[PDB]
Amino acid sequence: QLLNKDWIISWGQQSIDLWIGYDRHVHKFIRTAIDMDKNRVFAQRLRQSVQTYFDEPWALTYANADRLLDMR
Amino acid sequence: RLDGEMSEGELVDATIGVRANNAINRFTSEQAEGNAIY
Amino acid sequence: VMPVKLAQALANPLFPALDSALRSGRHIGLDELDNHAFLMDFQEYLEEFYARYNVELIRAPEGFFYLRPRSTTLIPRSVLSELDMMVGKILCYLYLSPERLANEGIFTQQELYDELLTLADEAKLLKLVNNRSTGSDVDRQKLQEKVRSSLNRLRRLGMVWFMGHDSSKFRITESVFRFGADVRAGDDPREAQRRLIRDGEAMPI
Amino acid sequence: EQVMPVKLAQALANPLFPALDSALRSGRHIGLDELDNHAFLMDFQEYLEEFYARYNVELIRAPEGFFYLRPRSTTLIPRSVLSELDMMVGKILCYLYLSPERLANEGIFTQQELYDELLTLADEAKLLKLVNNRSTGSDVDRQKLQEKVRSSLNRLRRLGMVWFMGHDSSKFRITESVFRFGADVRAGDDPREAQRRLIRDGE
Amino acid sequence: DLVTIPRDVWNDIQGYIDSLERENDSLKNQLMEADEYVAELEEKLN
Amino acid sequence: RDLVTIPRDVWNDIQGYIDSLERENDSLKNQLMEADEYVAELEEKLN
């Protein structure tokens, strides 16, 4: 929520690994997202674009080499 | 069980899927069956 | 004859898998440590080689790689229907959802479907699904299946890694950032869309 | 490892290679007509046989001089199989190429002759099943059959067995690459008898 | 004779296999119902 | 990180399997589209 505001023995070991993974994930997320849209404009603009998308459809491109033909 | 940690699959054995999830409604663990530990 | 580093890289046993994968559209994220490292070491020469095929090699700022054919390409190109683009945009959003962090990046298709119906004009998806449908349960289920088909098509391209033995969950990779190129710039989406067309990113429909 | 044989690099450096590669991976039966492509393949055959092996694909030269790519069950390049009616059209094209009249016609045939050949030497019931499983055996079915035969002929032209002549699609010429559909009848008997036997057996 | 794969790749392959199988099974019924609709329309027209 | 060790004779199976599923799915897509065109033509005939 803070980000939203502004832009027996074995159990311990497993919980520690889970927490480490959690921290890794939060670090990954901060790096990938907050630097890009430090001002939150990107997400709002995306919301609105999806909402009004149908007014002008469009589609992007990706290379698709023809598959190899073969017989039985 | 000796493991001491249960996975989501064991729970669902205990619209079947959707009703089960609604009944359930937690620690994520991608390496565990179903990627969930409760 | 051939640059030394290009020749050395081409002989690398890892090359054929990439060469066949990329020309089928696959985007390469950060996850594939070995493949991504190989591309990092030999970006310049690989770019020079493919440029002889009359196709371009692009490394967007996010850190992924993808192949973009030009007008005179020697390998065909293709596009994807409206529903797939809608699903791609929704996936792009979920990546950014601040409330998501509790989920570590794993998701479920139930959330994907439920969220989608909060934005799109209910009929305006129904018409693409079935003209006669006006909120019936059967046509809602039909759309539920169509979204799964679109998601499989999307995964083949490399936008999401499946997880576990149950298909009802998946993971998102950073290559989805491509769907935001429309809103990348602060100018009017329309002129930006035409600029994207001119750059060859997307063709109008 | 041995990074690169000199001849392999010299071959990959030839400016015409990229088009040949993209076409080959599409399965096109590159033949003699493309004198340039044939010469280039002749110069550097063995080494291209070596390289493509990494893809788990065999670059095979048929006895009659043409070249094509035959992959194995573990291909690293996607492969797709064409429909049966395409195979029937291929076999029929194989038969015509042997007609003595080819020399008189220089190999020029029009789609009408091929359509008549298929209709007369093919079972009507099987074809009617092919065109539409709900087909009523009426004319509209035969018209759509002609349309799809035209489409399959176009696909085969993409494979490169046949050539379109001039700027009218009504005229086309056959090349020696058609034997890929007749190699199964390499026996020394009459080609007509062998093809008729195979078609009767459903092969 | 033995191939080693990262856990993630194998997991992805298995998940994709199951997803594709489910999609194919669903589409079979979809085609069946479409053809039944065509048959019913044809029968009612006559 | 963790790895999985498998023999070739087993590995090749899934690679064949997924490809067969994909091809069958595409063929079914095409046939469904054809059936859709037929039903649309019938519908416009009725009305």
Residue numbers in the entry:
A (entry chain C): 191 to 197, 263 to 327
B (entry chain D): 42 to 55, 69 to 79, 89 to 101
C (entry chain E): 9 to 213
D (entry chain F): 7 to 209
E (entry chain I): 4 to 49
F (entry chain J): 3 to 49
Question: What is written in the article reporting this PDB entry?
Answer:
MukBEF folds the chromosome of Escherichia coli and related bacteria. The SMC protein MukB dimerizes at its ‘‘hinge’’ domain, which connects via the long coiled-coil ‘‘arm’’ to the ABC-type ATPase ‘‘head’’ domain. The heads are bridged by the kleisin MukF, whereby the C-terminal winged-helix domain (cWHD) of MukF binds the ‘‘cap’’ surface of one MukB, and the N-terminal middle domain (MD) binds the coiled-coil ‘‘neck’’ of the other MukB. MukF also recruits the dimeric KITE protein MukE.
Focused classification, signal subtraction of the MukF core, and focused refinement using neural-network-based regularization with Blush resolved a 73 kDa region of MukE bound to gp5.9. As observed previously in its RecBCD-bound form, gp5.9 formed a parallel coiled-coil dimer complemented by a β sheet of the N-terminal strands. gp5.9 bound along the DNA-binding cleft of MukE, overlapping along its full length with the DNA capture site. However, the orientation of gp5.9 with respect to the DNA molecule is broadly similar, in the sense that the long axis of the gp5.9 coiled coil aligns approximately with that of the double helix. Moreover, within the resolution limits of the structures, gp5.9 positioned several negatively charged residues (D11, D15, D21, E24, E36, D38, E43, and E45) near positively charged residues in MukE (R140, K150, R163, R164, and R179) or MukF (R322). Most of these ion pair interactions mimic DNA phosphate backbone contacts and thus prevent the natural DNA substrate from binding efficiently. Therefore, although there are significant differences in the details of binding to individual targets, the data overall support the designation of gp5.9 as a DNA mimic protein. The structure revealed that binding of gp5.9 to the MukE DNA-binding cleft is mutually exclusive with formation of the DNA capture state. We find that gp5.9 targets the DNA-binding site of MukE, which contacts DNA both in the capture state and when DNA is entrapped in the clamp compartment. Although gp5.9 targets DNA-binding sites by contacting residues involved in phosphate backbone binding, it encodes sufficient specificity to interfere with select targets.
